Design a protein around this nucleic acid. Structure first.
Ligand SMILES: [K+]
Ligand SMILES: [K+]
Ligand SMILES: [K+]
Ligand SMILES: [K+]
Ligand SMILES: [K+]
Ligand SMILES: [K+]
Ligand SMILES: [K+]
Ligand SMILES: [K+]
Ligand SMILES: [K+]
Ligand SMILES: [K+]
Ligand SMILES: [K+]
Ligand SMILES: [K+]
Ligand SMILES: [K+]
Ligand SMILES: [K+]
Ligand SMILES: [K+]
Ligand SMILES: [K+]
Ligand SMILES: [K+]
Ligand SMILES: [K+]
Ligand SMILES: [K+]
Ligand SMILES: [K+]
Ligand SMILES: [K+]
Ligand SMILES: [K+]
Ligand SMILES: [K+]
Ligand SMILES: [K+]
Ligand SMILES: [K+]
Ligand SMILES: [K+]
Ligand SMILES: [K+]
Ligand SMILES: [K+]
Ligand SMILES: [K+]
Ligand SMILES: [Mg+2]
Ligand SMILES: [Mg+2]
Ligand SMILES: [Mg+2]
Ligand SMILES: [Mg+2]
Ligand SMILES: [Mg+2]
Ligand SMILES: [Mg+2]
Ligand SMILES: [Mg+2]
Ligand SMILES: [Mg+2]
Ligand SMILES: [Mg+2]
Ligand SMILES: [Mg+2]
Ligand SMILES: [Mg+2]
Ligand SMILES: [Mg+2]
Ligand SMILES: [Mg+2]
Ligand SMILES: [Mg+2]
Ligand SMILES: [Mg+2]
Ligand SMILES: [Mg+2]
Ligand SMILES: [Mg+2]
Ligand SMILES: [Mg+2]
Ligand SMILES: [Mg+2]
Ligand SMILES: [Mg+2]
Ligand SMILES: [Mg+2]
Ligand SMILES: [Mg+2]
Ligand SMILES: [Mg+2]
Ligand SMILES: [Mg+2]
Ligand SMILES: [Mg+2]
Ligand SMILES: [Mg+2]
Ligand SMILES: [Mg+2]
Ligand SMILES: [Mg+2]
Ligand SMILES: [Mg+2]
Ligand SMILES: [Mg+2]
Ligand SMILES: [Mg+2]
Ligand SMILES: [Mg+2]
Ligand SMILES: [Mg+2]
Ligand SMILES: [Mg+2]
Ligand SMILES: [Mg+2]
Ligand SMILES: [Mg+2]
Ligand SMILES: [Mg+2]
Ligand SMILES: [Mg+2]
Ligand SMILES: [Mg+2]
Ligand SMILES: [Mg+2]
Ligand SMILES: [Mg+2]
Ligand SMILES: [Zn+2]
Lengths: 206, 122, 125, 114, 53
RNA sequence: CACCUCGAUGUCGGCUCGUCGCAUCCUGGGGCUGUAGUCGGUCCCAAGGGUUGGGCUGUUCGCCCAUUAAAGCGGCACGCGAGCUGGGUUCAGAACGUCGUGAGACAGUUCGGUCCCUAUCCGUCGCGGGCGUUGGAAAUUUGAGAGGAGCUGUCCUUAGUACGAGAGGACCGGGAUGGACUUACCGCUGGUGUACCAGUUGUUCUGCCAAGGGCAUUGCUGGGUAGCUAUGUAGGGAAGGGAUAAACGCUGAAAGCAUCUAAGUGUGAAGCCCACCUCAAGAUGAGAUUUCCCAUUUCUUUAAGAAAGUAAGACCCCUGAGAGAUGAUCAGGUAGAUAGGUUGGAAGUGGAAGGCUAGUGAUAGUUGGAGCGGACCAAUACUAAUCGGUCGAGGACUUAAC
RNA sequence: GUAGCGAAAUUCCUUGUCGGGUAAGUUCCGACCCGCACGAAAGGCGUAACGAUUUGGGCACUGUCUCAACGAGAGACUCGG
RNA sequence: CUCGUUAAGGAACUCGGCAAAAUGACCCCGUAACUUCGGGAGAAGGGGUGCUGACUUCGGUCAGCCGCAGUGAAUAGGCCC
RNA sequence: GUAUGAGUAGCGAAAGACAGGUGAGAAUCCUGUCCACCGUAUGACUAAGGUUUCCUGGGGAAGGCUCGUCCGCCCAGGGUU
RNA sequence: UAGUGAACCAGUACCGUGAGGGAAAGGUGAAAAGCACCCCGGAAGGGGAGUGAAAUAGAUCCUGAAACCGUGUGCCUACAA
């Protein structure tokens, strides 16, 4: 089981017993199965799913031709789902938030918000140097290694571009499903900026 | 958030007035202690006639903090000072009377005697 | 957000006030890209105050517009001087009474010689 | 944001009285010590109101046994049976943090009788 | 830190490979036909989008 | 010992950053035991992870205090000073004890004592351009390979059972909940929030009152939106296979017995390979699937020839942010909600101005939850994304089969 | 080698021993004296006031630190000289 | 690099509280050991500070009013053993 | 003499903005308005020192850390009773 | 780059308080016949047209090497240490 949606935002919800939990609102307009991949043709089993209808002027002739089989408008996002029952799906089929039930345990995949160019202290959570006592070492990345190699070992972590990484959060709880609004309320927080792509899958660990 | 060198008032009549945190028990690298945590402390200032006296190493439980606690219902409690109660090893308070309010979290931490003795539990 | 224009907060505020008053007076001025893209919002908000026209908007604008001479004319055999605030609340407001925002336009021109700074003309429509 | 508002409109409460910081309130807060459930009244002055919609929260401060205590509640928490405005106070600001420093007479708030 | 070795001509030219200018966005002015930067007022006739300014 | 370095290889300790060995501190597995149980002792396998906060001292070391499952030992120029410090050692000053007739001297002490360098190359962390991947493009993808993670406490139950005379007190098994670490995020608690709101002092200006502007660290002070944030919140190291280490075997001869081994066959660990997460076809071994365009013109030449209009498409340029040093990425360019403005809201602040009333007055009430309102929300083509331009295929050969 | 002082700007052994201070003090203060190697004008002992002197303790205060976060400006970054 | 703010803690940093923070103006009360009797001493520790009236012996006092805060900003000792 | 570093470091405390003029050419020159800075000075006089840098009219070779139509620069005249 | 330091306005310029120290810098052409005139340009500088035996002898002027820089391309080069 899987679906693609948009990170609408965050709020909080009161559950039965009065507990208050933070939830993330993720909207998922019904996704469409655009292509079925099989061992015979592609060598592996998976279903291609498209989401977020896209304006024709924003689409291309190749994209329109590709989505023609499913007979649907151009989709902004396309992703492949594995570990699904190929029998249950076929091109043109729709997938909605109702596929999940409240209390489901899911893996949520997103693209982390970007922080641009960041130093080692923030990027890797390394320790600063003393800020007084004559120290002239405040936010620097530490020694690069021993003398003997006459080089620097790989993985000597340094400053650079931070964020924008594919990150999966495992075992999040499906707080609520609103089929009317195509909304899923997921307990906790999820990676990605608002309006970014989010992928929900049935938790592999469970 | 109580850590080493943090000073706390004493909310009981055991004799001690102000204590200084020596250790935050419950872990090798634990840094901060909150309501319901037990700390090793030293008596820095003591009431002259009290049982507990200055310079003794004692165990105490935190009963209220400036940074208080969050409840499962989403509410919060905060106090205007950081106070603790000196306890024997079995959580029985050394003193006989408690001063000021106490947090309700001590109940699930099983400081029932302190909870009962407290003039008010919140 | 808003641009810093390479100035401190107070200096940027003063520069924006100066440029906005100059644009009110002259109705067409040449500046840089960023200066134009900030002055558009500032001057349009001043125009909104003028369109409102009440004393509250008058004083709110007065807090921003410079006390400069917008124009001088010979009338009733005497000289009449109109300040930037008076022009704002007498001409620009009534002029734009029917326009729903977007009172200014920016046209991109050649870059400056001394800097290659991208220059533009900002003017009331 | 409109979607969030629509989602949380259902759980928004409707029995909240009109109170602002500076008003003394009594909070019938449900409390459970096991199987038994009970109502404990926390009465004090409102020191802070913040947030919006379902996320709105308010803080009530009272001096009990000579020790200040502040409780923060979600405005729409179902665990609070009732909020009762005992009095209205004249305050000149939304956040009354300065009261934390004051004690006794200095902390008194004049009443307005709205 | 100083150059251990002088940079050779070939290496210098390689490094300068990307040290060059570009001229982009030039197209015929609709009014007079003289070339102009797109989205800019034509410096020759002063027109833009078919209007003198 | 004196082999490199005295036309200079920076010396103790500490900080940041680690990485590696196992002669293993804990955690994991096991044999023996002077192993009743709980604790242990010793030895074998095991380096996956972790292996602390202070007082003293320049210190290493060491003692001590308090914890922890544990508080390992070592190499890497006794790692790491073009990464930091400079307390000690080791200049010039001065002093004490001592030696010396003396200048002076003392691994004898004490107070004070300049730590320079704009990264060329390799190396490391990130981001682009070109070409290749053999017609040209738009997407989705397998995974050769690589990296990340790998820790553990306590309590309840089994059970006061097994064991033990008693005291005491389990293995295995099943649950709950933490510490440290770590991946994300701003709904909550808070921080910040220099073009948000309010109070206020001095002075100065708008001719004066009123109302405001300038400067005084944002003049100061009380709050605070978005964004960025931890101490705040959520999640993770879960189960599980394959082959193994030490160890234990089963069957079994050599060697009628015995024997775990020689053949044959199995159990067996935080260990190895998977399993979990991430990058990944420049993996030149350049992979795979779906979709789109179509075989054009001229000259040369049988040329895998050349250039010149193109198609699918891409870019230039322009409006921007959820992106960003710049490139890039992504959202849009009137086939339009991309941004500004406008309208309506929201957070936020806390009751605007001008009046009215009361008061001698400061001031209070009322008009009125008012006024103002950066980044937030929804509409609105009013302003600006116009007009245009550039690049971009016609698909080689051999041999199976058809 | 007297008075006085003494593990001291002098005590190597040495973190001497004891007490105070601290949860814990090789530093510090008080005391002892086997003064390696104090000692009376290269002065001995003490001393109010004074010291940008050296040393130890305490209150207040704080990012110094647990442990880092945000914001303003200059440089760094892009462009023209 | 210069500067502002910072939850909880408040020297746990460190060779060392280095740096930073805090005190800081005037008026009133009060002020220790020791002392060379001068000092210590601005010891320490506290209280007041705005605006409007009335009254003042002109320094005050009484009453009222406002704010979180009245040397409302800037410039002004940290203290003790 | 010419390279490399490299079109890199640096361009030496701080507020300018617009309109008009001049001109081959203007962020840099003139004018105007507003804004901002010093004001026991960044104001007004003088000694030393410098020695024409003073004024007027031209110039943009070189200098001015950019530009320059401008200058304490260059060219021509004048100026100290 | 020799030869006096000085073949040239040299003990000069410059440096130093002073004693003192102390440079660089020759060559058009036979003859200036030193490019009238035209074109671009504000000028500089160029292109013509001319002088000249020669102007790639045009005043930085005889010859004009090398370092260094640039233009065009016959061949090679984007799996290589
Ligand atoms: K040497
Ligand atoms: K054993
Ligand atoms: K290990
Ligand atoms: K230490
Ligand atoms: K090591
Ligand atoms: K160094
Ligand atoms: K090299
Ligand atoms: K804040
Ligand atoms: K004022
Ligand atoms: K001013
Ligand atoms: K490929
Ligand atoms: K009003
Ligand atoms: K409001
Ligand atoms: K002694
Ligand atoms: K001695
Ligand atoms: K002791
Ligand atoms: K002294
Ligand atoms: K001194
Ligand atoms: K700070
Ligand atoms: K610390
Ligand atoms: K020390
Ligand atoms: K004193
Ligand atoms: K007051
Ligand atoms: K003072
Ligand atoms: K050079
Ligand atoms: K160079
Ligand atoms: K001139
Ligand atoms: K010649
Ligand atoms: K060549
Ligand atoms: Mg640290
Ligand atoms: Mg090597
Ligand atoms: Mg200011
Ligand atoms: Mg103006
Ligand atoms: Mg509110
Ligand atoms: Mg020999
Ligand atoms: Mg050498
Ligand atoms: Mg071993
Ligand atoms: Mg200490
Ligand atoms: Mg070393
Ligand atoms: Mg080094
Ligand atoms: Mg002698
Ligand atoms: Mg000194
Ligand atoms: Mg938040
Ligand atoms: Mg928010
Ligand atoms: Mg006034
Ligand atoms: Mg929108
Ligand atoms: Mg001693
Ligand atoms: Mg002792
Ligand atoms: Mg002597
Ligand atoms: Mg003598
Ligand atoms: Mg003496
Ligand atoms: Mg440049
Ligand atoms: Mg703080
Ligand atoms: Mg605080
Ligand atoms: Mg310490
Ligand atoms: Mg330490
Ligand atoms: Mg200091
Ligand atoms: Mg003040
Ligand atoms: Mg460089
Ligand atoms: Mg300058
Ligand atoms: Mg001033
Ligand atoms: Mg002054
Ligand atoms: Mg002059
Ligand atoms: Mg002149
Ligand atoms: Mg110049
Ligand atoms: Mg000579
Ligand atoms: Mg020749
Ligand atoms: Mg020649
Ligand atoms: Mg290869
Ligand atoms: Mg090749
Ligand atoms: Zn034109």
């Amino acid at each position: 089981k899987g679906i693609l949606g948009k990170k609408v935002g965050m709020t909080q919800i009161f559950t039965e017993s009065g507990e208050l939990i933070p939830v993330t609102v993720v909207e998922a307009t019904p996704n469409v199965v655009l292509q079925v991949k099989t061992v015979e043709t592609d060598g592996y089993e998976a279903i291609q799913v498209g989401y977020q209808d896209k304006r024709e002027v924003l689409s291309n002739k190749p994209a329109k031709g590709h989505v023609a089989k499913a007979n649907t408008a151009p989709k902004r996002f396309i992703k492949e789902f594995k570990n699904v029952e190929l029998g249950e799906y076929e091109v043109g089929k729709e997938i909605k938030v109702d596929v999940f039930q409240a209390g489901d345990v899911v893996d949520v995949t997103g693209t982390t918000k970007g922080k641009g160019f960041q130093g080692a202290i923030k990027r890797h959570g390394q320790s600063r140097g003393p800020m007084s006592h004559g120290s002239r070492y405040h936010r620097r990345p530490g020694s690069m290694g021993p003398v003997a190699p006459n080089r620097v070992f790989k993985n000597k972590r340094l400053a650079g571009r931070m964020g924008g990484d594919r990150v999966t959060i495992q075992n999040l709880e499906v707080v609520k499903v609103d089929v009317e609004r195509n909304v899923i309320l997921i307990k906790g927080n999820i990676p990605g900026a608002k309006k970014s792509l989010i992928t929900i899958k049935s938790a592999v660990k469970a | 958030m109580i850590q080493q060198e943090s000073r706390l008032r004493v909310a009981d009549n055991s004799g001690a007035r102000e204590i200084l945190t020596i250790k935050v028990l419950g872990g090798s690298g634990r840094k901060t202690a909150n309501i319901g945590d037990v700390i090793v402390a030293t008596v820095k200032q003591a009431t002259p006639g009290g049982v507990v006296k200055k310079g003794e190493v004692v165990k105490a439980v935190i009963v209220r903090t400036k940074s208080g606690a969050r409840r499962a219902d989403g509410s919060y409690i905060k106090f205007d000072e950081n106070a603790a109660v000196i306890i024997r090893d079995d959580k029985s308070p050394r003193g006989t009377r408690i001063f000021g309010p106490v947090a309700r979290e001590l109940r699930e931490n099983n400081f029932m005697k302190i909870v009962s003795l407290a003039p008010e539990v919140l | 957000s808003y641009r810093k224009l390479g100035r401190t907060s107070s200096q940027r505020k003063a520069m924006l006030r100066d440029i906005t008053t100059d644009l009110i007076i002259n109705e067409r001025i040449v500046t840089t890209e960023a200066r134009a893209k900030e002055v558009r919002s500032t001057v349009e908000k001043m125009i909104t105050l003028g369109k409102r026209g009440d004393l509250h908007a008058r004083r709110q604008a007065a807090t921003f517009v410079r006390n400069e001479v917008a124009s001088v004319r010979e009338e009733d055999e005497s000289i009449v001087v109109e300040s930037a605030l008076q022009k704002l609340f007498n001409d620009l407001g009534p002029r734009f009474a029917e326009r729903q925002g977007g009172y200014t336009r920016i046209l991109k021109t050649e870059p400056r010689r001394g800097d290659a700074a991208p220059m533009v003309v900002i003017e009331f429509v | 944001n409109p979607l969030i508002q629509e989602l949380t409109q259902e759980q928004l409460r409707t029995d909240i009285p009109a109170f602002r910081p500076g008003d003394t309130v009594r909070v019938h807060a449900k409390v459970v010590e096991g199987t038994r459930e009970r109502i404990q009244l926390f009465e004090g002055v409102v020191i802070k109101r913040r947030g919006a919609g379902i996320s709105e929260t308010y803080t009530v401060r009272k001096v009990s046994n000579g020790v200040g205590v502040e409780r923060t509640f979600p405005l729409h928490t179902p665990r609070v049976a009732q909020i009762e405005v005992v009095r209205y106070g004249k305050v000149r600001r939304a956040k009354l943090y300065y009261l934390r420093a004051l004690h006794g007479k200095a902390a008194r708030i004049k009443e307005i009788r709205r | 830190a100083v150059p251990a070795r002088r940079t050779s001509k070939a290496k210098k030219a390689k490094r300068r490979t990307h040290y060059k200018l570009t001229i982009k966005g030039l197209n015929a002015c609709s009014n007079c036909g003289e070339m102009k930067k797109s989205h800019h007022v034509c410096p020759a006739c002063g027109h833009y989008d078919g209007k003198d300014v």
